[PDB]
Amino acid sequence: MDDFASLPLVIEPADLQARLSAPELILVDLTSAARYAEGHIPGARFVDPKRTQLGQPPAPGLQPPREQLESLFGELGHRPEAVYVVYDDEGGGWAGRFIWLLDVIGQQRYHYLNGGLTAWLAEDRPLSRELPAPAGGPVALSLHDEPTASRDYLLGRLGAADLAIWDARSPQEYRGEKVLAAKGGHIPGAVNFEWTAAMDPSRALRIRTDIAGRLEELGITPDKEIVTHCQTHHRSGLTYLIAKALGYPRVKGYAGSWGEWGNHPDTPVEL
């Protein structure tokens, strides 16, 4: 993985700053048009969060169609030597979702900027308002279903001993007090660890260092397949990325998410 090969998945602002000029770097920014324009990490290429999502009913959290994907990745300069570093400015939900897309397109080498722009800014690190030149036309892509749990797959696995479902929504959604679909509640057997509970606002929204014990407390252990979700697989972008970063060998994003589950005639719900 070139100048980035020696680092773990989650890296710190110092490791990135040292490597901003690496020719194999594809630095991806998933903040917002305004934030990117105000000042981004130098060489960063902007990917509007909406572009990571199908954004059509009945399950808008699914991955975008192949065409949008080919062009997006063609724009970014996707190529064999590439090593992606990903950040956002919300603690990692969009960054983590982009990383799940990287798994969806077979990319092996990437890293998450711990705390993203929030950390970068807290340390007064350099900002640029300049636009990199887009790479080229759309690249032809190979798409994988392994990183993703379909609705039927999850229905089939419910109640199993070797599965944990990590619902990343707020506890009020999980308990069906706050209802954003025809059905409120959670997926039977799921446990709850809100995406924001994994961040440490005292360290510029980095992943809390005691994260493994907290996940272990809930039975979210690496000897099990982890299937994570929220409402649209945004918030669960961060929890997918965390399971990966901790080295869980079996991790999937349920991309349909509650947007699908809470609206589908076939799905059991539990309160």
72 and 126 in one domain?
A: yes
Task: Give, in order, the Cα–Cα distances in Å from 159 to each of 154, 167, 187, 254.
Answer: 10, 15, 10, 16
Q: Which positions make up the binding site for substrate? A: 235
> What is the helix, strand, coil percentage profile of the chain, to 5?
35, 15, 50
CA 210/CA 31 separation, integer angstroms? 26
Q: Where are the alpha helices (DSSP H) in the chain?
A: 13-18, 33-38, 66-76, 93-105, 116-122, 151-157, 171-174, 211-217, 235-245, 257-261
70 and 19 in one domain?
A: yes
Cβ-defined contacts of 183-187 (< 8 Å, 24+): 183/261, 183/262, 183/263, 183/267, 183/269, 184/262, 184/269, 184/271, 185/262, 185/269, 185/270, 185/271, 186/269, 186/270, 186/271, 187/154, 187/158, 187/229, 187/261, 187/267, 187/268, 187/269, 187/270
Among 241, 235, 252, which Cα is nearest to 207's? 241
Q: Which residues contact 83 (CB under 8 A, 6 or more apart)?
A: 1, 2, 3, 4, 22, 24, 25, 26, 109, 110, 111
156 and 120 in one domain?
A: no
214 and 82 in one domain?
A: no
| HSE-up of residue 36 (Cα within 13 Å, Cβ side) | 19
Contact between residue 88 and residue 231 where contact means Cβ atoms under 8 Å apart:
no
CA 32/CA 49 separation, integer angstroms? 7
User: The domain that contains 242 carries what CATH number?
Assistant: 3.40.250.10
**SS3 (DSSP) at 38:** helix
134 and 29 in one domain?
A: yes
163 and 45 in one domain?
A: no
158 and 49 in one domain?
A: no
CA 167/CA 197 separation, integer angstroms? 12
197 and 74 in one domain?
A: no
Task: Give, in order, the Cα–Cα distances in Å from 224 to each of 62, 95, 239, 245.
Answer: 24, 24, 15, 15
Q: Where are the alpha helices (DSSP H) in 56-206?
A: 66-76, 93-105, 116-122, 151-157, 171-174
Tokens of 168: 């990343």
- Give the active site residue among 230, 238, 243, 245: 230
- Using DSSP bridges, classify how beta strands 191-192 and 163-167 pair: parallel, antiparallel or unpaired: parallel
Is residue 25 within a helix (H) or strand (E), and if so which, with residue range?
Answer: strand 25-29
Contact between residue 92 and residue 207 where contact means Cβ atoms under 8 Å apart:
yes
Q: Which of 144, 169, 199 is the last residue of a domain?
A: 144
Q: Which of 144, 179, 199 is the last residue of a domain?
A: 144
CA 240/CA 191 separation, integer angstroms? 15
**SS3 (DSSP) at 15:** helix
Q: Which of 93, 119, 144 is the last residue of a domain?
A: 144
Among 156, 154, 68, 157, which Cα is nearest to 105's? 68
139 and 16 in one domain?
A: yes
240 and 163 in one domain?
A: yes
Residue type, 41: I
Range of the domain at 190: 145-270
Among 59, 68, 37, which Cα is nearest to 138's? 68
Contact between residue 182 and residue 263 where contact means Cβ atoms under 8 Å apart:
yes
89 and 5 in one domain?
A: yes
The angstrom resolution of this structure is 2.1
96 and 172 in one domain?
A: no
230 is catalytic: yes
Q: Dump the DSSP string for 110-130.
A: EEEETTHHHHHHHTT---B-P
CA 231/CA 240 separation, integer angstroms? 14
Give the total number of structural domains in the chain: 2
